[PDB]
Amino acid sequence: SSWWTHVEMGPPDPILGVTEAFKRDTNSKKMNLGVGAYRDDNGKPYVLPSVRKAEAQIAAKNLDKEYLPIGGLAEFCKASAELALGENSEVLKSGRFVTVQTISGTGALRIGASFLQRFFKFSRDVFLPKPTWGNHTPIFRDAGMQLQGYRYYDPKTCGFDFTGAVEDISKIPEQSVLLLHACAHNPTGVDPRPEQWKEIATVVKKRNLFAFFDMAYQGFASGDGDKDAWAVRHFIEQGINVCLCQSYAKNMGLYGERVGAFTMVCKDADEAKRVESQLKILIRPMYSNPPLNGARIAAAILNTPDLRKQWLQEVKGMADRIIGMRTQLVSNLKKEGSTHNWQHITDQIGMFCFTGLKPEQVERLIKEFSIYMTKDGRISVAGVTSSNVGYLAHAIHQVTK
Amino acid sequence: SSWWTHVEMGPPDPILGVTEAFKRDTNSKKMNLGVGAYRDDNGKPYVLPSVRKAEAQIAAKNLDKEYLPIGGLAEFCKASAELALGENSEVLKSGRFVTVQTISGTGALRIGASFLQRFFKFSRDVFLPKPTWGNHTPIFRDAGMQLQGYRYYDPKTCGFDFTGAVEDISKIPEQSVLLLHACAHNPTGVDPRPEQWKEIATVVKKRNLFAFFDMAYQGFASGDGDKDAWAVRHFIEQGINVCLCQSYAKNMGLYGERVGAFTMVCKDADEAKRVESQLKILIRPMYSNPPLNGARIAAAILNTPDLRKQWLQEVKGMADRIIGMRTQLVSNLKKEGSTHNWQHITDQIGMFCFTGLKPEQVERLIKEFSIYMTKDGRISVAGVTSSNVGYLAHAIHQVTK
Numbered sequence A, B: 001s002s003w004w005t006h007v008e009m010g011p012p013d014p015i016l017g018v019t020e021a022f023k024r025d026t027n028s029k030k031m032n033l034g035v036g037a038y039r040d041d042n043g044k045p046y047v048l049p050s051v052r053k054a055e056a057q058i059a060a061k062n063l064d065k066e067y068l069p070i071g072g073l074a075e076f077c078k079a080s081a082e083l084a085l086g087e088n089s090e091v092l093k094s095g096r097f098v099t100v101q102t103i104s105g106t107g108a109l110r111i112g113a114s115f116l117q118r119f120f121k122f123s124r125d126v127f128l129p130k131p132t133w134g135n136h137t138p139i140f141r142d143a144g145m146q147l148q149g150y151r152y153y154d155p156k157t158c159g160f161d162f163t164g165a166v167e168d169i170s171k172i173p174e175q176s177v178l179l180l181h182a183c184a185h186n187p188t189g190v191d192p193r194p195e196q197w198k199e200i201a202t203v204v205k206k207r208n209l210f211a212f213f214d215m216a217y218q219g220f221a222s223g224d225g226d227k228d229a230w231a232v233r234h235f236i237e238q239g240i241n242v243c244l245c246q247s248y249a250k251n252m253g254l255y256g257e258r259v260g261a262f263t264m265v266c267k268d269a270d271e272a273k274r275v276e277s278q279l280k281i282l283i284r285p286m287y288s289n290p291p292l293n294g295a296r297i298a299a300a301i302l303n304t305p306d307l308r309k310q311w312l313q314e315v316k317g318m319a320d321r322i323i324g325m326r327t328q329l330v331s332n333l334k335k336e337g338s339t340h341n342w343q344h345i346t347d348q349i350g351m352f353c354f355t356g357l358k359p360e361q362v363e364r365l366i367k368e369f370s371i372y373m374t375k376d377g378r379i380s381v382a383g384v385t386s387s388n389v390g391y392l393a394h395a396i397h398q399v400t401k
Helices: A014-024 A049-058 A076-084 A091-094 A104-119 A136-143 A160-171 A194-207 A230-237 A271-285 A292-303 A305-335 A341-345 A360-369 A386-399 B014-023 B047-057 B074-083 B091-093 B104-119 B136-143 B164-172 B194-206 B231-238 B269-286 B293-303 B305-335 B343-347 B359-370 B391-400
Strands: A097-103 A123-130 A146-151 A177-181 A210-215 A242-247 A258-263 A352-354 A376-379 B098-104 B127-128 B146-151 B177-181 B209-214 B243-245 B260-265 B352-354 B378-379
Touching: A049 A242, A049 A292, A049 A305, A049 B047, A076 A097, A076 A230, A076 A242, A076 A258, A076 A292, A097 A271, A097 A360, A104 A136, A104 A210, A104 A258, A104 B269, A123 A136, A136 B269, A160 A194, A160 A230, A210 A230, A230 B091, A242 B343, A258 A292, A258 B194, A271 B104, A271 B136, A271 B243, A292 B098, A292 B293, A305 A341, A305 A386, A341 A376, A352 B164, A352 B209, A360 A386, B014 B391, B047 B305, B074 B091, B074 B231, B074 B260, B091 B359, B098 B104, B098 B269, B104 B136, B104 B209, B104 B243, B104 B260, B104 B269, B127 B231, B136 B146, B146 B164, B194 B260, B209 B231, B231 B243, B231 B293, B260 B269, B293 B305, B305 B343, B305 B391, B359 B391
Parallel strands: A123 A146, A123 A177, A177 A210, A210 A242, B127 B146, B127 B177, B177 B209, B209 B243
Antiparallel strands: A097 A258, A242 A258, A352 A376, B098 B260, B243 B260, B352 B378
């Protein structure tokens, strides 16, 4: 008959619809809280000037477009490791790691995920939080691993179930893989506190699970890179060789540039040497080598202080703006006479929020006020603006009252 | 007791190894025929001026860095389909196709396999030519598919084994997937003549195989993209619905920007819709979306007629440079007084040539004349210059007496 008449129509994407539902709304005070990227105080995309300064810096150099090592830019990988681990890190000094440039974080997760399939002989189960980013399960699943859950978010408190996650984690089998967001949870926004993080490390240490980290939001979450990477850095100090997925999409604004990295911290350099060769092997088949523009720009910013001083300044303008929107949404709800306790909205870190609002609530907001968010009740906080934090506080007061 | 001590050091890569062992040679007269990309007649990387003009066109536009959709830049996918099939052939005008942006040919290549592993009951076997690009096995292999070979290269003529290729394709179990190089075959450089293609296709049609084309060298091969894509377009006009992997790395010099496309021709516009949705579903797990810059450059060149006109002239000029060398090589090889038949060097297409040399001759060449190539007899004709065709022909004549 035909080849593809056996090919099913896929399921719709909530995220795409929400925006799409958004691009359809005619309203002039309409908001997209389904948006995945940082937006300026005008709800307009922002390209980081330092990125533009680097883009200029490179162009002045009349460079080539030659293939890149499988691992990526040498300068990028190394610089990217230092960003994550700190200047006076031992791992860097010891040499006991490999860093590879991957297509963004989603690239980081997948290579790492594959490498898990192929070489992680102590398990097939990757423990994801509850609830964790949408792409996570199908990243691992196609990757070839089993998936599992551990308590994280507590829905009544709109906070961290420390006892829950700590209790569940304590129940994870030994030498199993645990995925912990380094900071700025997607999509809840809930994070562990250092003392809480401290207690996790020991639990992982006692268990001997393997820790796999996603730091998709470094710098961007608080505006302090170091704090933001505090857990990854802590886990390693405490004897746990992690692996890290770094995304420069948000903190650096190279969303489409696709800058990312996967880092493995090993006991000794030789092991690193070995891991690298295999990391490569996995990759050649996937794409030959990763993209050129992004790494160069990222490298450019990190590797030249005046530019880096500037970017890291900008990251603060954004992180702080988000902090501000969060604080504002709450002051306003309280000013709209809203009864409830929204201090979660502020308690939370990053650009994603779990409002605790229920779908029937979402719908009132969506149909009645032209506002868009998914039904879990998360908002993307970067779709919020001075202009509209009020239209937002208003509806939420109205529905939740 | 480390995690990865069971992880062993991988085997060395002959191509990467030859390139490096070339880099280590201290001779002034060394030649790198293992190089995987095009080089100027100065032995230098070439950034097409069309790309500089275009890069300025997009840069002056003050453009976004937003995520592209899963299938990438729409404009690039359509333009790339136009390029491959002709801005007008009906498949494009009926809309019975889907094109997604992929990370180059390789990326495009694996996404295609992943699609085959996921949605193809009909076979688990892929038939690739003996021999093919080295990364063919692994992309299919990692994808989950089974690999087999059909005769292609004739070791006696250093040419096409038409007779064997026909005999074998015919004997392929029906509805299996068979891989075809559209033009500029890697590593032989051997291409079927068009009439042969017509006879080849009926076999594909009668045995009703899925036609999986890899076209990374459209235009780069003969200087006429319409001629280079002729195999694919003919396969489509003869009624075989194919999938296509396009790379813009070689003929646009966009090696490291990682620009590619995966194309599917379907029965109707909707089937294309269902296949698009499912492609998108595969891709999101692999990396969420494809890179931005290269797609922009390629899109501009493709769509600004004056930039495009300059690009095609730069491509042929590029194209005849390699031809320039093969035609040059034979003369000198003849000038140096070689008895042997070197017509195969002129009959072949692309920047890759199978000379038929014995590993021992390569080895004398490698120590004695300092010329680097893989032991299979493969030369990268892009490493050969007007200057060194004399040095190379002299050397080859010397090893071949």
